[PDB]
């Protein structure tokens, strides 16, 4: 399961569902991930609304904000819920980027998400049943 295309497909979905357009077996993981995400965003929508209004994205601080939030998110543990939030947070930042016309920032966020998946979350995912475990937990 390629972590990059997991990111790419997810970000593209979340954006196109908000009205933006973006130049981007195994398909089950992608479908399950974005379904869990839409459910996550819906339930805590007011919260995500308050979070997006405090992001305060600038081209200078962007990568710092991503690094900081993500680090504190997994600072004291990793579970599938937090991994979903990690994708959803990435989505929030990508949406707030095109909201201010910083399209190139989306590609960078996509890069950062991918880099974080390979470097940190990957070992956890493998040692916790792989993505198949996630599908069994967030599917039917």
């Amino acid at each position: 399961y390629d972590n990059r295309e997991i990111v790419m497909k997810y970000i593209h979905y979340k954006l196109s569902q908000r009205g933006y357009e973006w130049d981007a077996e195994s398909e089950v993981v992608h479908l399950t991930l974005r379904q869990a995400g839409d459910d996550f965003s819906r339930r805590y929508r007011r919260d995500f609304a308050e979070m997006s209004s405090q992001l305060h994205l600038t081209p200078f601080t962007a990568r710092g904000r991503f690094a900081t939030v993500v680090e504190e998110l997994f600072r004291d543990g990793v579970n599938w819920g937090r991994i979903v939030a990690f994708f959803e947070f990435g989505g929030v930042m990508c949406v707030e980027s095109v909201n201010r016309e910083m399209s190139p920032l989306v590609d960078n966020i996509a890069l950062w998400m991918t880099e974080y998946l390979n470097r940190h979350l990957h070992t956890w995912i493998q040692d916790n049943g792989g993505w198949d475990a996630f599908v069994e937990l967030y599917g039917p």
Binding site: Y44, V70, E72, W80, R82, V84, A85, L137
Partner: peptide, 19 residues
């Protein structure tokens, strides 16, 4: 008001519903 704190909190509520 803190972003990662709230995100982490609701993430765990979401996860506890799946056990």
């Amino acid at each position: 008001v803190q972003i990662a704190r709230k995100l982490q909190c609701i993430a765990d509520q979401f996860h506890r519903l799946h056990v």
